[PDB]
Amino acid sequence: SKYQVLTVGNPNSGKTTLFNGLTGAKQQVGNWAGVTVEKKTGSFVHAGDEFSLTDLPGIYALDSGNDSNSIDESIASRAVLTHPADVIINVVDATCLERSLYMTLQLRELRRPMIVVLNKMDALKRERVHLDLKQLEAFLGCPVLALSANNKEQVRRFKEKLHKLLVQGIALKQIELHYGAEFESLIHELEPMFAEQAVSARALAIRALENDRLVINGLKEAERQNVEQRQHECQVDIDLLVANVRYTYLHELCTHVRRT
Ligand SMILES: Nc1nc2c(ncn2[C@@H]2O[C@H](COP(=O)(O)OP(=O)(O)CP(=O)(O)O)[C@@H](O)[C@H]2O)c(=O)[nH]1
């Protein structure tokens, strides 16, 4: 079998280190379709199956229609929405969970098969910090694996676990992110227009309320006007509201996960 894998994470997460450890010399560099940004792909074979890897440029969040130039965030937002992938590997710097897991939450809302890879666990153990990984799986609702991407042996072990999870299929558990009665009803008003898409209608409705360019652009003018009218029905700033809700959840998460 041939498996398609996307790797996504913040800059400095060790995403490139894991990618290189998995593919070695079997890598190519090109361009993303329609732009000049570098496209890095690689492959490896394991236990008779082929693994096809596409690396996404490092980003801190998905596209939210922010004038902040960020061609990379558009590319990663597009890929995370429309690029084929049997699994999205979200590489997270475990020494920096509260910030790194912000995009993790956005990815989880898409409901695409994904796993969270906590990288730099050696740095954590140097800080004498323990992460309750079962609690972390409970809060994220997706497989969570911990390693150091500079350790060849742990990377080799990661291949076996990744291969097993792809053969099993990835079991996702609903993520209890509630944005408050008012915004939830706005998501509810908008969800039917994103039914019958390749991604969660709830996710697309949220991203459209966040003004994700990749979502808004595909809409017809009347659908755009329904989205922009919903946006002004929000009594508060949508960007602040979703950030608050996401970071409030991540504060509860770290409490029950992180111990020194
Ligand atoms: N201690 C430790 N450092 C690691 C580990 N994985 C990567 N690093 C370090 O983190 C730094 C960033 O890694 P890199 O792979 O470059 O990060 P990225 O997230 O791919 C972003 P970019 O490659 O553009 O910097 C590197 O200096 C690398 O040595 C790990 O498991 N443990």
* Terminal CA-CA length for the chain: 43
- Residue 38 labelled as part of a binding site: yes
Distance 150 CA to ligand 1 centre (A): 8
Name beta bridge partners: 3.
Answer: 51
* Residues 31/37, Cβ–Cβ less than 8 Å: yes
Sheet of 49-55: strand order equals 27-31, 38-46, 49-55, 2-9, 87-93, 114-119, 144-146
In angstroms, the CA 114 to CA 141 distance is 10
Q: How many angstroms from the chain centroid is the CA of residue 163?
A: 19
How many whole angstroms from 16 Cα to the centroid of ligand 1? 7
Which residues in the chain are classed under CATH 1.10.287.1770? 181-247
158 closest CA partner among 149, 170, 167: 149
Rounded distance between C-alpha atoms, residue 218 and residue 199, angstroms:
14
* 1.10.10.10, 3.10.20.30, 1.10.287.1770, 3.40.50.970: CATH of 181-247: 1.10.287.1770
Atom 13 in ligand 1: residue holding the nearest Cα: 14
Helix (H), strand (E) at residue 94: none
> Residue 251 burial by CB count (10 A; 0-12/13-18/19+): exposed, middle or buried?
exposed
The protein residue whose alpha carbon is closest to atom 6 in ligand 1 is 14
Residues of the chain with CATH 3.40.50.300: 2-168
Judge contact between 165 and 87, C-beta under 8 A: yes
Rounded (10°) CA dihedral 90, 18, 48, 2: 40
Quote the ligand 1 centre to 119 CA distance (angstroms).
9
- On whether 57 is known to bind a ligand per the annotation, the reply is yes
Q: Which residues pair with 34 in a beta bridge?
A: none
Looking from the CA of residue 91, the nearest atom of ligand 1 is: 19
Ligand 1 atom closest to Cα of 149?
A: 31
> 9 C-alpha vs ligand 1 centroid, how far in Å?
11
Residue list, ligand 1 pocket, CB within 6 Å: 9, 11-17, 58, 119-120, 122-123, 148-150
Instruction: Report how many helices (DSSP H) and strands (DSSP E) the chain contains, helices first.
Output: 11, 9
* Ligand 1 pocket mutation pick from 17, 60, 124 by most atoms within 8 angstroms of CB: 17
Residues forming beta bridges with residue 43, ordered by sequence position? 52
Name the 3-class secondary structure at 42.
Answer: strand
CATH topology for 2-168 is: Rossmann fold (3.40.50)
Q: Does residue 145 contact residue 89 with C-beta atoms inside 8 Å? A: no
**Ligand 1 nearest atom to the CA of residue 58, by list position:** 21
CA distance 169 to 166: 5
> How many angstroms separate the Cα of 45 from the Cα of each of 3, 14, 26, 53?
10, 22, 10, 11
Q: What residues are paired with 28 via a beta bridge? A: 41
Resolution (A): 2.1
Given a contact cutoff of 8 angstroms between Cβ atoms, the answer to whether 258 and 250 are in contact is: no
Residue 186, phi then psi, degrees to nearest 5: -65, -45
215 labelled binding-site residue = no
Which tokens sit at 18? Answer: 């894991």
| 45 CB neighbour count, 10 Å cutoff | 10
Both tokens assigned to 227: 């989205």
